[PDB]
Amino acid sequence: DEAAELMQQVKVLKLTVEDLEKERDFYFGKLRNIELICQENEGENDPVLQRIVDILYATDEGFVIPDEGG
Amino acid sequence: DEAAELMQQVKVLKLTVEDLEKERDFYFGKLRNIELICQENEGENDPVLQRIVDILYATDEGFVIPDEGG
Ligand SMILES: C[C@@H](Sc1nnnn1C1CCCC1)C(=O)NCc1ccco1
Ligand SMILES: C[C@@H](Sc1nnnn1C1CCCC1)C(=O)NCc1ccco1
């Protein structure tokens, strides 16, 4: 029953995919909403948004990702 | 070659999983960092953080998720 076990695997895998897909873009649209607050207040009123833009472009990786936070 | 095709499937599935897993928690820790700015400024200095907390608890779902943003 080689493939039979793999049938279970694609199922548990795809379901993890589906729940992860939803979350990825669920919060992804959220960062934009926080960035939209930034576009409103950056330089205009509140500098706090500047350091939250830093969040949306904070890349904790091995390689240093080039970004421009302004 | 039934299982052979499934071997490919678990691979492409798991890889999507792995890249999605990293992103889920990658940004997940980020929302906390934005929330930490909130804990600093909420009621103290900047009300902007209040409406960004609204983001971290904004649940675009069918069912209405009960939350307390303060
Ligand atoms: C967090 C995103 S920022 C980003 N990337 N595409 N769109 N956006 C927007 C979403 C939030 C604000 C801009 C980022 O730098 N990823 C790092 C990365 C991974 C691969 C290439 O680079
Ligand atoms: C966005 C999170 S808020 C959340 N949930 N667990 N920890 N956190 C923290 C991360 C950001 C600030 C608090 C949320 O309501 N999900 C909706 C949900 C899905 C299932 C149950 O409920």
Side-chain angles (χ1 to χ4, degrees):
Chain A
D1 300 85
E2 185 67 83
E5 302 185 280
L6 282 125
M7 307 292 181
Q8 182 194 271
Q9 295 314 92
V10 297
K11 181 175 64 177
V12 305
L13 246 42
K14 72 180 302 293
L15 294 173
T16 309
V17 165
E18 296 183 270
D19 284 286
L20 260 42
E21 289 192 277
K22 71 183 188 187
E23 289 185 78
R24 211 301 299 241
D25 291 301
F26 190 102
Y27 298 93
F28 216 73
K30 297 299 178 294
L31 295 327
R32 292 281 281 165
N33 194 212
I34 118 177
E35 182 178 63
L36 265 50
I37 304 176
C38 305
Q39 300 177 329
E40 292 180 54
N41 296 333
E42 283 189 276
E44 182 63 71
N45 289 92
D46 302 291
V48 291
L49 280 309
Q50 171 66 90
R51 58 203 60 143
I52 335 172
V53 173
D54 174 81
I55 291 184
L56 314 183
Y57 280 95
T59 46
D60 44 287
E61 288 277 72
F63 185 81
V64 180
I65 305 301
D67 75 279
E68 297 179 81
Chain B
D1 300 85
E2 185 67 82
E5 302 185 281
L6 282 125
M7 307 293 181
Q8 182 194 271
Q9 295 314 92
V10 297
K11 181 175 64 177
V12 305
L13 246 42
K14 72 180 302 293
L15 294 173
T16 309
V17 166
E18 296 183 270
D19 284 286
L20 260 42
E21 289 192 278
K22 71 183 188 187
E23 289 185 77
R24 211 301 299 241
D25 291 301
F26 190 102
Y27 298 94
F28 216 73
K30 296 300 178 294
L31 295 327
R32 292 281 281 165
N33 194 213
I34 118 177
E35 182 178 63
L36 265 50
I37 304 176
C38 305
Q39 300 177 330
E40 292 180 54
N41 296 333
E42 284 189 276
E44 182 63 70
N45 289 92
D46 302 291
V48 291
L49 280 309
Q50 171 66 90
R51 58 203 60 144
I52 335 172
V53 173
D54 174 80
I55 290 184
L56 314 183
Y57 280 95
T59 46
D60 44 287
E61 288 276 72
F63 185 81
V64 180
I65 305 301
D67 75 279
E68 297 179 80

